[PDB]
Design a protein around this motif. Structure first.
Motif, short mmCIF file in Angstrom:
data_model
loop_
_atom_site.label_atom_id
_atom_site.label_comp_id
_atom_site.label_asym_id
_atom_site.label_seq_id
_atom_site.Cartn_x
_atom_site.Cartn_y
_atom_site.Cartn_z
N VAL A 259 -9.90 -1.82 -10.58
CA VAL A 259 -8.57 -2.39 -10.55
C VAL A 259 -7.51 -1.40 -11.03
CG1 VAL A 259 -7.17 -4.15 -11.65
CG2 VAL A 259 -9.34 -4.80 -10.67
N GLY A 260 -7.93 -0.48 -11.88
CA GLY A 260 -7.01 0.53 -12.46
C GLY A 260 -6.60 0.26 -13.91
N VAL A 261 -7.34 -0.59 -14.63
CA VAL A 261 -7.07 -0.86 -16.03
C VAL A 261 -7.42 0.37 -16.86
CG1 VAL A 261 -7.56 -2.41 -17.93
CG2 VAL A 261 -7.67 -3.26 -15.59
N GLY A 262 -6.54 0.75 -17.78
CA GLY A 262 -6.75 1.90 -18.65
C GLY A 262 -7.77 1.66 -19.77
N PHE A 263 -8.17 2.76 -20.39
CA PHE A 263 -9.27 2.77 -21.35
C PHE A 263 -9.07 1.73 -22.43
CE2 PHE A 263 -11.31 4.08 -25.21
CZ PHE A 263 -12.56 4.37 -24.85
N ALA A 264 -7.95 1.80 -23.14
CA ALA A 264 -7.83 0.97 -24.34
C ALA A 264 -7.81 -0.49 -24.00
CB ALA A 264 -6.60 1.35 -25.16
N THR A 265 -7.12 -0.84 -22.92
CA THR A 265 -7.13 -2.21 -22.46
C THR A 265 -8.51 -2.66 -22.04
OG1 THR A 265 -4.82 -2.12 -21.84
CG2 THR A 265 -6.10 -3.85 -20.82
N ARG A 266 -9.23 -1.81 -21.31
CA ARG A 266 -10.60 -2.18 -20.97
C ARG A 266 -11.46 -2.46 -22.17
NH1 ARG A 266 -10.66 2.36 -17.97
NH2 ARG A 266 -12.53 3.11 -19.11
N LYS A 267 -11.34 -1.61 -23.20
CA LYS A 267 -12.23 -1.81 -24.33
C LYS A 267 -11.92 -3.11 -25.05
CE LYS A 267 -13.91 0.92 -23.00
NZ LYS A 267 -15.30 1.06 -22.45
N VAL A 268 -10.65 -3.42 -25.27
CA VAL A 268 -10.30 -4.65 -26.01
C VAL A 268 -10.51 -5.86 -25.15
CG1 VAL A 268 -8.45 -5.77 -27.20
CG2 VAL A 268 -8.83 -3.37 -27.60
N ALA A 269 -10.15 -5.77 -23.88
CA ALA A 269 -10.35 -6.91 -22.99
C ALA A 269 -11.82 -7.19 -22.77
CB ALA A 269 -9.66 -6.68 -21.63
N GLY A 270 -12.63 -6.15 -22.70
CA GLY A 270 -14.04 -6.35 -22.47
C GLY A 270 -14.76 -7.03 -23.63
N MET A 271 -14.23 -6.93 -24.83
CA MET A 271 -14.82 -7.62 -25.97
C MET A 271 -14.58 -9.10 -25.97
SD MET A 271 -16.43 -5.59 -28.00
CE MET A 271 -16.45 -6.56 -29.49
N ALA A 272 -13.50 -9.57 -25.31
CA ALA A 272 -13.09 -10.95 -25.48
C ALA A 272 -14.13 -11.93 -24.94
CB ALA A 272 -11.81 -11.17 -24.76
N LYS A 273 -14.19 -13.08 -25.54
CA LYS A 273 -15.03 -14.20 -25.13
C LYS A 273 -14.11 -15.42 -24.93
CE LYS A 273 -19.00 -12.02 -25.67
NZ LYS A 273 -19.31 -11.03 -24.61
N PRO A 274 -13.35 -15.39 -23.84
CA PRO A 274 -12.30 -16.38 -23.67
C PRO A 274 -12.82 -17.77 -23.43
CG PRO A 274 -12.47 -14.98 -21.78
CD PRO A 274 -13.36 -14.39 -22.78
N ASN A 275 -11.95 -18.71 -23.71
CA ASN A 275 -12.11 -20.04 -23.14
C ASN A 275 -11.18 -20.18 -21.95
OD1 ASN A 275 -12.22 -21.44 -26.44
ND2 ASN A 275 -13.95 -20.89 -25.16
N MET A 276 -11.61 -20.90 -20.97
CA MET A 276 -10.80 -21.18 -19.82
C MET A 276 -10.61 -22.70 -19.76
SD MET A 276 -11.53 -20.17 -15.86
CE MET A 276 -13.21 -20.70 -16.13
N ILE A 277 -9.36 -23.13 -19.68
CA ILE A 277 -8.99 -24.53 -19.71
C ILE A 277 -8.33 -24.88 -18.40
CG2 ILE A 277 -7.86 -26.33 -20.94
CD1 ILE A 277 -8.26 -23.05 -22.69
N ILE A 278 -8.95 -25.77 -17.63
CA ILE A 278 -8.49 -26.09 -16.29
C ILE A 278 -8.10 -27.56 -16.29
CG2 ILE A 278 -9.08 -26.24 -13.86
CD1 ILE A 278 -11.10 -23.96 -14.28
N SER A 279 -6.89 -27.84 -15.82
CA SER A 279 -6.38 -29.17 -15.73
C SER A 279 -5.63 -29.36 -14.41
CB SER A 279 -5.49 -29.47 -16.94
OG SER A 279 -4.41 -28.60 -17.01
N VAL A 280 -5.51 -30.62 -14.00
CA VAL A 280 -4.83 -30.99 -12.81
C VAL A 280 -3.87 -32.13 -13.13
CG1 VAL A 280 -5.11 -31.90 -10.42
CG2 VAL A 280 -6.71 -30.26 -11.38
N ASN A 281 -2.67 -32.06 -12.59
CA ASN A 281 -1.68 -33.12 -12.70
C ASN A 281 -1.00 -33.20 -11.32
OD1 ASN A 281 0.70 -34.56 -13.05
ND2 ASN A 281 0.75 -34.08 -15.28
N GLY A 282 -1.37 -34.20 -10.55
CA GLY A 282 -0.94 -34.29 -9.15
C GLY A 282 -1.40 -33.12 -8.33
N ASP A 283 -0.50 -32.45 -7.67
CA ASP A 283 -0.88 -31.28 -6.89
C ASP A 283 -0.84 -30.00 -7.72
OD1 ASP A 283 -1.32 -32.74 -4.49
OD2 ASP A 283 0.74 -32.61 -3.97
N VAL A 284 -0.47 -30.07 -9.01
CA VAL A 284 -0.36 -28.87 -9.80
C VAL A 284 -1.63 -28.63 -10.62
CG1 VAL A 284 0.97 -27.61 -11.51
CG2 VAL A 284 2.14 -29.19 -9.97
N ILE A 285 -2.23 -27.46 -10.41
CA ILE A 285 -3.41 -27.03 -11.13
C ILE A 285 -2.95 -26.04 -12.16
CG2 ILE A 285 -5.68 -25.96 -10.93
CD1 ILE A 285 -5.57 -26.72 -7.92
N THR A 286 -3.49 -26.15 -13.39
CA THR A 286 -3.21 -25.19 -14.45
C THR A 286 -4.53 -24.61 -14.91
OG1 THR A 286 -1.23 -26.39 -15.13
CG2 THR A 286 -2.19 -24.90 -16.76
#
Length: 131
Positions: A23-50
């Motif tokens: 994708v072209g992500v630089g070193f420092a961002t890759r290292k910190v982003a790669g450590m993360a263990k995110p939660n993903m929160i998915i919701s729907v309200n009518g036709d809008v998805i978040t």
């Protein structure tokens, strides 16, 4: 999108560093982003998805209507134009920026939510389970 709704926690990742490099992500961002263990929160309200991602790296939130392009500033700070569709039960998210493109697919598999990120020939697979 009822079977996507809820709060999901990252339990495994493969090839994410390689995807980010493609994708072209630089070193420092890759290292910190790669450590993360995110939660993903998915919701729907009518036709809008978040879809919200909460992590120690960079919280994000997108809201959208299927098929309707929107502006997204990604966690690695790309300014992209995104379109998300539901194809055969799979959320397909295309990001366009700087003449480039990447596709993120989100699908339900058993009790998991599997996220496949593809840039050219490089795929990363990120597996989430219910929190």
């Amino acid at each position: 999108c009822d079977a996507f709704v809820g709060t999901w926690k990252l339990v495994s990742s493969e090839n994410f560093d390689d995807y980010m490099k493609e994708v072209g992500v630089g070193f420092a961002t890759r290292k910190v982003a790669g450590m993360a263990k995110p939660n993903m929160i998915i919701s729907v309200n009518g036709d809008v998805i978040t879809i919200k991602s909460e992590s120690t790296f960079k919280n994000t939130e997108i809201s959208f209507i299927l098929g309707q392009e929107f502006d997204e500033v990604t966690a690695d700070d790309r300014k992209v134009k995104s379109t998300i569709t539901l194809d055969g039960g799979v959320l397909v998210h295309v990001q366009k920026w700087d003449g480039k493109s990447t596709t993120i697919k989100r699908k339900r598999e058993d009790d998991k939510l599997v996220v496949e990120c593809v840039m050219k020939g490089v795929t990363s697979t990120r597996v989430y389970e219910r929190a």
